[PDB]
Design a protein around this motif. Structure first.
Motif, PDB file in Angstrom:
ATOM      1  N   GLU A 170      54.107 117.407 137.372  1.00  0.00           N
ATOM      2  CA  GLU A 170      55.266 117.261 137.807  1.00  0.00           C
ATOM      3  C   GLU A 170      55.980 115.849 137.422  1.00  0.00           C
ATOM      4  OE1 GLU A 170      56.737 118.897 141.549  1.00  0.00           O
ATOM      5  OE2 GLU A 170      57.408 117.016 142.422  1.00  0.00           O
ATOM      6  N   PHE A 171      57.098 115.609 137.152  1.00  0.00           N
ATOM      7  CA  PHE A 171      57.510 114.131 137.010  1.00  0.00           C
ATOM      8  C   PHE A 171      58.928 114.151 136.651  1.00  0.00           C
ATOM      9  CE2 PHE A 171      58.660 114.473 132.159  1.00  0.00           C
ATOM     10  CZ  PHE A 171      58.588 115.709 131.952  1.00  0.00           C
ATOM     11  N   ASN A 172      59.561 112.844 136.605  1.00  0.00           N
ATOM     12  CA  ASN A 172      60.920 112.663 136.746  1.00  0.00           C
ATOM     13  C   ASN A 172      61.343 112.764 135.297  1.00  0.00           C
ATOM     14  OD1 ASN A 172      63.790 111.960 137.019  1.00  0.00           O
ATOM     15  ND2 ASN A 172      63.316 109.986 137.731  1.00  0.00           N
ATOM     16  N   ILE A 173      61.899 113.667 134.904  1.00  0.00           N
ATOM     17  CA  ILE A 173      62.410 114.192 133.478  1.00  0.00           C
ATOM     18  C   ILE A 173      63.361 113.276 133.076  1.00  0.00           C
ATOM     19  CG2 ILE A 173      63.310 115.955 131.874  1.00  0.00           C
ATOM     20  CD1 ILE A 173      62.213 117.982 133.828  1.00  0.00           C
ATOM     21  N   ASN A 174      64.229 112.648 134.196  1.00  0.00           N
ATOM     22  CA  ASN A 174      65.019 111.581 133.796  1.00  0.00           C
ATOM     23  C   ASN A 174      64.593 110.097 133.639  1.00  0.00           C
ATOM     24  OD1 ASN A 174      67.348 113.801 134.008  1.00  0.00           O
ATOM     25  ND2 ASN A 174      67.056 113.402 136.463  1.00  0.00           N
ATOM     26  N   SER A 175      63.441 110.010 133.665  1.00  0.00           N
ATOM     27  CA  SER A 175      62.883 108.747 133.453  1.00  0.00           C
ATOM     28  C   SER A 175      62.376 108.472 132.345  1.00  0.00           C
ATOM     29  CB  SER A 175      61.425 108.519 134.658  1.00  0.00           C
ATOM     30  OG  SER A 175      60.829 107.516 134.328  1.00  0.00           O
ATOM     31  N   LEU A 234      58.912 110.307 131.040  1.00  0.00           N
ATOM     32  CA  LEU A 234      59.122 111.304 129.728  1.00  0.00           C
ATOM     33  C   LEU A 234      58.350 110.693 128.874  1.00  0.00           C
ATOM     34  CD1 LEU A 234      60.220 114.042 128.816  1.00  0.00           C
ATOM     35  CD2 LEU A 234      62.303 112.599 128.180  1.00  0.00           C
ATOM     36  N   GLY A 235      58.554 109.399 128.303  1.00  0.00           N
ATOM     37  CA  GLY A 235      57.831 108.829 126.907  1.00  0.00           C
ATOM     38  C   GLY A 235      56.310 108.940 127.335  1.00  0.00           C
ATOM     39  N   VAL A 236      55.780 108.943 128.526  1.00  0.00           N
ATOM     40  CA  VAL A 236      54.322 109.007 128.620  1.00  0.00           C
ATOM     41  C   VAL A 236      54.119 110.393 128.660  1.00  0.00           C
ATOM     42  CG1 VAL A 236      52.537 108.762 130.259  1.00  0.00           C
ATOM     43  CG2 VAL A 236      54.366 107.111 130.262  1.00  0.00           C
ATOM     44  N   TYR A 267      59.792 104.226 124.056  1.00  0.00           N
ATOM     45  CA  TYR A 267      59.916 105.526 123.059  1.00  0.00           C
ATOM     46  C   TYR A 267      61.258 105.983 123.089  1.00  0.00           C
ATOM     47  CZ  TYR A 267      54.915 105.324 123.563  1.00  0.00           C
ATOM     48  OH  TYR A 267      53.413 105.051 123.816  1.00  0.00           O
ATOM     49  N   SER A 268      61.979 106.260 122.091  1.00  0.00           N
ATOM     50  CA  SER A 268      63.032 106.772 122.080  1.00  0.00           C
ATOM     51  C   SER A 268      62.878 108.392 122.118  1.00  0.00           C
ATOM     52  CB  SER A 268      63.745 106.755 120.362  1.00  0.00           C
ATOM     53  OG  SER A 268      64.862 107.435 120.350  1.00  0.00           O
ATOM     54  N   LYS A 270      50.565 111.643 126.771  1.00  0.00           N
ATOM     55  CA  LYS A 270      49.819 113.028 127.246  1.00  0.00           C
ATOM     56  C   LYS A 270      49.844 114.035 126.115  1.00  0.00           C
ATOM     57  CE  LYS A 270      49.181 116.211 130.767  1.00  0.00           C
ATOM     58  NZ  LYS A 270      49.394 116.473 132.133  1.00  0.00           N
ATOM     59  N   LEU A 271      50.987 114.412 125.804  1.00  0.00           N
ATOM     60  CA  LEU A 271      51.090 115.632 124.796  1.00  0.00           C
ATOM     61  C   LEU A 271      50.863 114.894 123.209  1.00  0.00           C
ATOM     62  CD1 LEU A 271      53.926 117.597 126.135  1.00  0.00           C
ATOM     63  CD2 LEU A 271      51.472 117.927 126.404  1.00  0.00           C
TER      64      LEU A 271
END
Ligand SMILES: OC[C@H]1O[C@@](CO)(O[C@H]2O[C@H](CO)[C@@H](O)[C@H](O)[C@H]2O)[C@@H](O)[C@@H]1O
Ligand SMILES: [Mg+2]
Length: 580
Positions: free
Chosen positions: A229-234, A238-240, A258-259, A245-246
């Motif tokens: 779980e994470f803040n998708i708006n961050s 999100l960049g991480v 990251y863009s 990670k992925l």
DNA sequence: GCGATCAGCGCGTAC
DNA sequence: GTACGTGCTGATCGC
């Protein structure tokens, strides 16, 4: 040294002279149904401060305000006019608006208060509004003594600055632009804002309910795919998840990391299913946050209307801007967002929304100013301009133009209008800089007149220091001589684009003035609600549609006469969405 | 040092 | 090229 003035307890006859600097202070940024905190008048007889509760209840003062023969000089008269409209008081006779005057002289100064305008003429005997009212959370109206002197100093500055400003406008050949275009338009915008646009709140709420469900669902899907779980708006979070990670490929970077812009995500979609979900999540979120929740927050609960404010003295090109809410960026391109428009409805029963838009006005304006034979002929034949451009660039017949060819030619056309550059087009079409340069070279071979204009306008900007529009609006471009490539590059593109975007703005602004005059002569109840750069949105009794179908297009098409025809399309319906 | 605020900006809509 | 609203975040405020 304090400025002398009478702190009046009642209105006197000398306060009602036929010429005066007038200040009707509305401190709230959004002036709709807002309080008037004080009034100041400066004329041949002296300087006066009046308490609103007193002045606005006085029959003589109110009559004076509405007397067109009693001239007033102000700063942002639209703000005062609208605030007064909400109080059932009419403001007439405004012959000079310092805000609009300063704006026309130099949009770049960002003049948003009397002090900034005065500074342009070495006049500093007035404080900036922010110094008096404070900023942000600490913004507040000061005690009467302080408030009174400030409003009087503002009226005094307006009184003194009128002549110098009008003289410079005359020198620039912009006096008519102020007196015949912007000032009359100001009154029309005030009527539009005051009228507001009716909103079907239940329709928006319904959409909000469905979106909330879809969001939750996509939201959980994303956490499942991310393994956490994470803040998708961050941007950082999100960049991480995506690039660390992925380990998805890093195709583009921002200045801080990251863009994750939509175009980047589209390219990453093939690598992991989480990508399409993030895109969907953002699509839903955009509608929910800005067009559903954001819109509902500003709807007046008592009337269910939204009353935008058209900033008439902000853009560097002469266009208007719209705020709280911005009604100039309501979705239309994609169906999912376009549905938001079903929520904007007529303000009365048996009325309909009528929308008319110029077809390619900027490219038509370019054809006119550049006097490019090929481009002018294309519009004289009312050809599909993008297909025509594809035919010329790729040197093929109409039947040989494939969808991808037209798409790229379309992008070249936008690039030309926006101020072309190989780097710019390369990013837009995701091709190499060399390939973009080839498209541009091919375009100029087909449109040599456009090439000449682009070269000449950049040189003109350098020689004169500014560029102008059809109705003499101007924009200074000091960076045109910058030694920094990028900075100068932007200036050159602004030199190419401003005369086009700006002239298009001049034209529709005149169309608005001409339209209102015709609607009044025809005794039509139809009225303007919004302007979205190249289009006008009105509402009127269903019985007026046929007349509007002939009247609106004609007025808009005849606003100015160019070397090429002007073409206006129109539609009407039960909602803004249906006016398609 | 930290919560509240302010100020910059990526992003995504419009033309 | 021209805008504005949004949410997040580093900078700055105020204790
Ligand atoms: O009244 C609009 C007029 O006021 C200025 C300041 O002189 O902007 C103020 O009002 C706008 C509409 O509410 C806000 O967006 C802006 O933040 C506020 O300062 C001018 O820019 C504008 O022409
Ligand atoms: Mg159009």
């Amino acid at each position: 040294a304090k400025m002398a003035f009478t702190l009046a307890d009642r209105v006197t006859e000398e306060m009602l002279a036929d010429k005066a600097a007038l200040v009707v202070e509305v401190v709230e940024e959004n002036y709709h149904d807002a309080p008037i905190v004080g009034i100041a008048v400066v004329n041949e007889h002296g300087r006066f401060f009046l308490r609103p509760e007193t002045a606005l209840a006085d029959p003589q003062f109110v009559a004076w305000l509405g007397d067109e023969t009693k001239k007033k000089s102000m700063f942002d008269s639209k703000r005062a006019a609208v605030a007064l409209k909400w109080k059932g008081i009419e403001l007439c006779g405004v012959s000079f608006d310092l805000l609009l005057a300063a704006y026309l002289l130099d949009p770049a100064q960002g003049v948003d208060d009397v002090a900034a305008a005065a500074k342009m003429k070495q006049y500093e005997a007035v404080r900036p509004d922010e110094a008096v009212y404070g900023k942000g959370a600490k913004r507040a109206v000061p005690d009467e003594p302080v408030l009174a002197e400030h409003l009087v100093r503002k009226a005094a500055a307006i009184w003194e600055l009128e002549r110098p400003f009008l003289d410079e406008l005359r020198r620039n050949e912009q006096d008519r632009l102020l007196v015949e275009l912007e000032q009359p338009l100001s009154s029309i915008l005030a009527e539009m804002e005051f009228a507001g646009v009716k909103v079907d709140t239940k329709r928006l709420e319904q959409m909000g309910k469905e979106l909330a469900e879809q969001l939750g669902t996509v939201e959980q899907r994303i956490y499942e795919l991310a393994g956490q779980e994470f803040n998708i708006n961050s941007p950082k979070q999100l960049g991480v998840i995506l690039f660390e990670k992925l380990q998805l490929p890093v195709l583009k970077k921002t200045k801080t990391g990251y863009s994750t812009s939509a175009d980047v995500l589209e390219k990453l979609a093939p690598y992991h299913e989480i990508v399409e979900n993030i895109l969907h999540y953002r699509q839903l979120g955009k509608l929910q946050s800005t067009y559903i929740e954001g819109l509902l927050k500003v709807v007046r609960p008592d009337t269910k209307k939204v009353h935008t404010i058209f900033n008439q003295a902000l853009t560097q090109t002469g266009r208007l801007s719209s705020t709280e809410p911005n009604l100039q960026n309501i979705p239309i391109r994609l169906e999912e967002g376009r549905k938001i428009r079903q929520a904007f409805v007529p303000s009365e029963s048996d009325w309909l929304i009528f929308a008319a838009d110029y077809s390619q006005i900027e490219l038509r304006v370019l054809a006119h100013i550049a006097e490019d034979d090929n481009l002018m002929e294309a519009f004289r034949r009312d050809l599909d301009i993008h297909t025509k451009t594809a035919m010329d660039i790729f040197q093929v017949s109409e039947d040989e133009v494939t969808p991808n060819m037209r798409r790229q030619a379309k992008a070249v056309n936008f690039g030309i209008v926006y101020g072309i550059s190989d780097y710019g087009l390369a990013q837009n079409l995701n091709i190499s800089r060399k390939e973009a340069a080839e498209f541009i070279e091919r375009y100029f071979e087909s449109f040599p007149g456009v090439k000449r204009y682009m070269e000449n306008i950049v040189q003109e900007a350098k020689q004169k220091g500014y560029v102008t529009t059809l109705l003499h609006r101007r924009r200074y471009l000091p960076d045109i001589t910058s030694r920094n490539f990028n900075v100068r590059s932007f200036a050159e593109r602004m030199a190419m684009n401003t005369p086009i975007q700006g002239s298009a703005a001049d034209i529709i602004k005149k169309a608005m003035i001409d339209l209102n005059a015709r609607l009044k002569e025809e005794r039509l109840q139809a009225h303007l609600l919004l302007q979205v750069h190249d289009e006008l949105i009105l509402e009127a009794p269903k019985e007026e549609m046929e007349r509007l179908c002939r009247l609106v297009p004609e007025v808009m098409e005849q606003a100015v006469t160019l070397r090429v025809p002007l073409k206006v399309d129109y539609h009407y319906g039960s909602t803004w969405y249906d006016a398609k």
